[PDB]
């Protein structure tokens, strides 16, 4: 029988990704891989094993092309004519962490488990984070050559 | 110090003393069998070349002949009236791996 994680088999570690000057799409897919625990060989779809991912410098993140002014982030309140949109440029100015969060949130499974994964993603606008007591391991986005 | 054994078209990871359920073999209970090997690990080293594997074989004894779980099949297609009932029990042989 294939091995399946037991009660206490799961383990966690903390990763901090410098979001400065990283492409939004590229950074998000890297974080969405970490949070789901895809890197571990102990992966199991119905058990979360992802590692807490801290994203710092979340307001410097680079978006290519004209997407800073022509990409809208829509939201509907349910009331008739309640569809209000904010272009990415505005969404970065008011509260910048949202742009990184949504682009990660839409990368994870949408089921109940994907709601549990979100609890393990902390993203901050500034270059500093309060989680220094947990000793995050700095993480960088490379690509295995084939 | 374990080995991966080919039998019945499937490869099982066994060591000394493990008990496995493999497809039926022509060997009465209590008899001993020898099976080929797909890979052997001894401590830290690994034997993977096809030549050395052909030199080694896993010996095992046949515990008994059993049957698998009962499978009930009821094929069906709506608005037609097509029912087909049929059971199945796979015959299984269970081995105790003695030595490699």
């Amino acid at each position: 029988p294939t091995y399946t994680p037991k009660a206490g088999d799961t383990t966690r570690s903390w990763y901090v990704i410098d979001a400065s000057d990283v492409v939004l799409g590229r950074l998000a897919s890297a974080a969405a891989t970490l949070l789901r625990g895809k890197h571990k060989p102990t992966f199991t779809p119905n058990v979360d094993g992802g590692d807490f991912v801290i994203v710092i410098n979340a307001d410097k993140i680079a978006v290519s092309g004209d997407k800073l002014t022509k990409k809208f982030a829509y939201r509907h309140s349910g009331y008739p004519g309640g569809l209000r949109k904010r272009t990415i440029g505005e969404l970065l100015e008011k509260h910048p962490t949202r742009v990184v969060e949504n682009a990660i949130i839409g990368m994870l499974p949408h089921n109940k488990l994907g709601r549990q994964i979100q609890k393990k993603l902390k993203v901050y606008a500034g270059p500093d984070h309060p989680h220094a007591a947990q000793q995050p391991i700095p993480f960088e986005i490379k690509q295995v050559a084939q | 110090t374990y080995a991966i054994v080919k039998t019945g078209g499937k490869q099982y990871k066994v060591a000394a003393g493990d008990v496995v359920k493999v497809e039926k073999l022509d060997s009465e209970p209590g008899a001993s069998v020898s099976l080929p090997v797909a890979l052997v690990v001894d401590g830290a080293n690994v034997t993977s070349k096809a030549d050395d594997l052909a030199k080694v074989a896993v010996t095992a004894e046949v515990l008994e002949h059993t049957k698998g779980p009962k499978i009930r099949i009821h094929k069906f297609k709506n608005k037609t009236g097509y029912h087909k009932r049929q059971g199945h029990r796979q015959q299984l042989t269970v081995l105790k791996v003695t030595g490699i």
Binding site: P41 | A38, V46, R72
Partner: protein, 124 residues
Amino acid sequence: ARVKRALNAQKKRRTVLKASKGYRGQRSRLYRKAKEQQLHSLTYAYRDRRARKGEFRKLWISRINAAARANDITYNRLIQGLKAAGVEVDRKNLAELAVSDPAAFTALVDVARAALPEDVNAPS
């Protein structure tokens, strides 16, 4: 020779009802509605037994590719190496080696790296 259909008919009612225990609502009490479930229940199983083989093969690939990238080698190259190197361990045990005893898997990866061609994009 009038025959009362109680004995002959009650036989099939017990089978379905006993086999439909654990269902929620009406599908656990009434023979008519339980039989409607047993048509679906035994159709789902026969479809899921075939799909289980494909599903479990998949879970193994995810564990192999996760450990293969930990040793800096992509999965598709790792398999190309292993096939060329003459190693014929299937995916079930490869995923088993990757999780339980990582020392052997590193040995297997190094075998795959050696047997790979010098320039994998060559038109050979």
